[PDB]
Amino acid sequence: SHEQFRAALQLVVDPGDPRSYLDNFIKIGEGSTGIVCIATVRSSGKLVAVKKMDLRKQQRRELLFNEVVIMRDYQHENVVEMYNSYLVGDELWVVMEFLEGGALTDIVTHTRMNEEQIAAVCLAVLQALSVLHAQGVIHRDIKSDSILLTHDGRVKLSDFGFCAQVSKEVPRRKSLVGTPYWMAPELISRLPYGPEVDIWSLGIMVIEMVDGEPPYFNEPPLKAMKMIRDNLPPRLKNLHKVSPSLKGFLDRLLVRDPAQRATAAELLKHPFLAKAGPPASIVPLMRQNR
Numbered sequence: 645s646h647e648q649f650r651a652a653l654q655l656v657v658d659p660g661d662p663r664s665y666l667d668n669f670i671k672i673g674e675g676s677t678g679i680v681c682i683a684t685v686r687s688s689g690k691l692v693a694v695k696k697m698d699l700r701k702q703q704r705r706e707l708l709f710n711e712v713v714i715m716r717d718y719q720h721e722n723v724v725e726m727y728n729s730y731l732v733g734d735e736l737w738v739v740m741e742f743l744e745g746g747a748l749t750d751i752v753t754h755t756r757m758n759e760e761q762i763a764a765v766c767l768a769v770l771q772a773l774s775v776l777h778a779q780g781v782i783h784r785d786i787k788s789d790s791i792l793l794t795h796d797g798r799v800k801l802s803d804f805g806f807c808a809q810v811s812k813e814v815p816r817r818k819s820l821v822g823t824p825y826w827m828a829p830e831l832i833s834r835l836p837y838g839p840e841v842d843i844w845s846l847g848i849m850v851i852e853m854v855d856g857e858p859p860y861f862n863e864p865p866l867k868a869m870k871m872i873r874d875n876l877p878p879r880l881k882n883l884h885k886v887s888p889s890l891k892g893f894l895d896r897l898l899v900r901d902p903a904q905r906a907t908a909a910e911l912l913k914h915p916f917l918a919k920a921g922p923p924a925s926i927v928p929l930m931r932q933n934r
C-alpha cells in the first residue's frame with residue numbers, strides 16, 4: 645500500500661523538488677498532519693509557506709489527497725493559495741502563499757474582536773463555504789485554527805485535510821470527523837450529514853470570537869461531545885455584550901435540526917454582515933502591532 649500510495653500521489657502532484665527555487669527552509673508551526681516552514685523565492689525572496697507531511701505518520705493516508713486538490717480546484721479570494729505540490733522522499737510538500745497575520749486562534753485567545761471584525765471573518769468564511777458546498781464538498785474542520793489572516797486583514801480558509809464530498813449516490817457522509825468542541829450534534833450522534841455541519845461549526849467559531857473559547861472547552865473531548873449531543877444550542881457567556889443582529893445571525897447557525905439550519909447561501913444575505921469592515925480593520929488585532 646505504501647508504495648501503491650506513493651505512486652498514486654506522485655501522479656497528482658507536480659514533479660521534482662522545490663529546492664529548485666526555494667532557500668531558507670525554517671520551521672514555524674506544527675500540527676497533527678505535520679510541520680510547516682517558511683522558505684524564500686531564490687530569485688526575489690518572496691516568502692512562501694511549505695507544509696511537510698509524512699506519508700507514513702498519517703492516521704488516514706487517503707486524506708492527503710485533500711491537502712492538494714481542494715486548493716487546486718477551489719481557488720477563491722478567501723481560500724489559501726497553493727502554488728505547487730511535491731513528493732520529497734516520503735513526505736508530501738505543499739507550497740502556499742505565506743499569510744503574515746497567522747491563525748485566527750491567536751487573536752481570539754489574546755484580544756476581544758468587535759462585531760465589525762467578526763462580521764468580516766464571517767463573510768469571508770461563508771464565501772469560501774458557499775462555493776465548496778455548491779459542489780458538495782464539506783469542510784468538516786471549521787474552527788479559528790483553520791482560518792488565516794494576511795498582514796492587510798483579508799481572511800482565508802485553510803486546513804482542508806478533513807474534506808469530504810457529496811453527490812446523488814452518496815448524499816450524506818457518515819464519518820466521525822472534526823474537532824470535538826466544533827462538531828455538529830447530528831455528526832456526533834452518528835446521523836448521516838451534509839454541509840450543514842460546517843455552518844454549526846461556524847457558529848461555534850463565532851462563540852470563539854466573542855467568549856474566547858467554544859462551549860465545554862474545559863471538559864475532556866468525549867464528555868464534551870456527549871454534552872453537545874444531549875443539550876440544547878449553547879449560550880453565549882457574553883450575550884449581554886453582543887448586538888441583536890449578531891444574535892439573530894448566530895441563532896440561524898446553532899440550530900440542532902440541520903434542515904432548519906441556515907445555509908451559507910442564505911446567510912450571505914443576513915444583515916449582520918453589512919457590519920463587516922475592510923481588511924484594514926482586522927490588522928490591529930495581529931500580535932505584531934498589538
Ligand SMILES: N#CCC(=O)N[C@]12C[C@](Nc3cncc(Nc4ncc(C5CC5)s4)n3)(C1)C2
Nearest residue numbers: 673674675676677678680693741742743744746
Ligand atoms: N498541521 C498544520 C497546520 C499548521 O501548523 N498551521 C500553522 C501554525 C502556523 N503559524 C503561522 C504563524 N503566522 C503566520 C502563518 N502563516 C501561514 N501562512 C500559510 C500557512 C500554510 C497554511 C499552512 S501558515 N502561520 C503554521 C499556522
